[PDB]
């Protein structure tokens, strides 16, 4: 069917730039024009600019202008957005969308899975794990909480498993927070009944797949 | 520029009611009952997808429950009823001027009953205490709202500000909420102190609870 395809995440140094791909298919590529959208983490939409892939024709933000520029590739249907001169600011999601018209309002109908850009001087750096040992004798109740800390790590994303893929009730992954260290740092806890502590062995598996770190830690 | 304004910021409904959210503008966004207001829905981790478009034209896929309203400045969406796929966020957008903008966004929320949070501390591991630094965990299970409010007080009355907050998104059965604050102090630092307690603070809570270790 009709759909637009963009480029993998990509981590780039401060002050280098990024060349971002949407390639269309499902229909006549330069019968329609193409939007661009940002999504800084945790804010909202916010439109860049906009391609008429037929003549070439932009028409920026005021506010994107000289920092983001547009470009189409009628032969392989690929639109293209770069932005350069990166900083921390530029970390976003950044959605192409298929633009439409209707009695002179346009609106996007088909958005792309959008591509996220990480600014920053990290370096791929693998995660550590320092178990988060259940109480200290506080018993009283019946359930307990235990977890397992991932320190320090980069890019994101982590994957936190627990008893190894079999263990999915009460478990409690929390996003990652960025240090100052411009390093990562995420949490992965499951409540258990203080009845089976003694009698279970809990371990939280951790993959980070860009450094390559599988860690198997027993709370 | 045009000017979108949505509210409430978040609104938190029960499966089966029905919502209205409004978006207002700036500036008239019309001419001659011809409209240039469009509606997306987007859920976490997820592309927006467009809902309604000329102020009033329902999109293929979406469903009859949904219907947008308004001219000039004052526009609303409305959801007659709330089935669990309508649970996410909503932007109002404007594209009568150049530049185009969205609105701030609404999220509907999965109103419950209101939750005591179960309270955790977690004191610094060993392998921690040898890298040099320590971090002190302080969880917060499943609770309603998601208003909540975690207290480090080392040493007492001494409460500091060195912590980092994460909460987690609302359950996909119990519609809860998770919280989790750490304070990363040098293993020196953690050394000369000895009461470490985290103050929570929930309507659920008759009084504000606190868990701290030695």
């Known amino acids: 069917q009709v759909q637009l395809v963009q480029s993998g995440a990509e981590v780039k140094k401060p002050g280098a730039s990024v060349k971002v791909s949407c390639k269309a298919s499902?229909?006549?590529?330069?019968?329609?024009?193409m939007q661009w959208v940002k999504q800084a983490p945790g804010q909202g939409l916010e439109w860049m600019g906009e391609?008429?892939?037929?003549?070439?024709?932009?028409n920026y933000n005021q506010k994107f202008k000289g920092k983001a520029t547009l470009t189409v590739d009628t032969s392989t249907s690929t639109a293209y957005m770069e932005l350069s001169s990166l900083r921390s600011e530029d970390t976003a999601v950044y959605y192409c969308?298929?633009?439409?018209?209707?009695?002179?309002?346009?609106?996007?109908?088909?958005w792309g899975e959008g591509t996220l850009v990480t600014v920053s001087s990290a370096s791929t750096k693998g995660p550590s794990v320092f178990p988060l040992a259940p109480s200290s004798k506080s018993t009283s109740g019946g359930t307990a909480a235990l977890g397992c800390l991932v320190k320090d790590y980069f890019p994101e994303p982590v994957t936190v498993s627990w008893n190894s893929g079999a263990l999915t009730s009460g478990v409690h992954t929390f996003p990652a927070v960025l240090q100052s260290s411009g390093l990562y740092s995420l949490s992965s806890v499951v409540t258990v009944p203080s009845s089976s502590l003694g009698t279970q062995t809990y371990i939280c598996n951790v993959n980070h797949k860009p450094s390559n770190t599988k860690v198997d830690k027993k709370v | 520029e045009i000017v979108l304004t949505q509210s409430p910021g978040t609104l938190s409904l029960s499966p089966g009611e029905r919502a209205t959210l409004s978006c207002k503008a700036s500036?008239?966004?019309?001419?001659?009952?011809?409209?240039?207001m469009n509606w997306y829905q987007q859920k976490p981790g997820q592309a927006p997808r467009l809902l309604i478009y000329?102020?009033?034209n329902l999109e293929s896929g979406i469903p009859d429950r949904f219907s947008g309203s308004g001219s000039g400045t004052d526009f609303t969406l409305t959801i007659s009823r709330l089935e669990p796929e309508d649970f996410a966020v909503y932007y109002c957008?404007?594209?009568?001027?150049?530049?185009?903008?969205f609105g701030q966004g609404t999220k509907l929320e999965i109103k419950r009953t209101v939750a005591a949070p179960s309270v955790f501390i977690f004191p610094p591991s060993d392998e921690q205490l040898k890298s040099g630094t320590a971090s002190v965990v302080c969880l917060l299970n499943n609770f309603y709202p998601r208003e909540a409010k975690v207290q480090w007080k080392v040493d007492n009355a001494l409460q500091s500000g060195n912590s980092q907050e994460s909460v987690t998104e609302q359950d996909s059965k119990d519609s809860t909420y998770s919280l989790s604050s750490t304070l990363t102090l040098s293993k020196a630092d953690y050394e000369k102190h000895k009461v470490y307690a985290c103050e929570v603070t929930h309507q659920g809570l008759s009084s504000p609870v606190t868990k701290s270790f030695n």
């Open positions: 969308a298929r633009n439409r018209d209707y009695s002179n309002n346009w609106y996007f109908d088909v």
């Open positions: 499902g229909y006549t590529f330069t019968s329609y024009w």
């Open positions: 391609i008429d892939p037929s003549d070439s024709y932009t």
């Open positions: 500036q008239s966004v019309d001419y001659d009952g011809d409209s240039y």
């Open positions: 000329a102020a009033s």
């Open positions: 957008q404007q594209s009568n001027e150049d530049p185009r903008t």
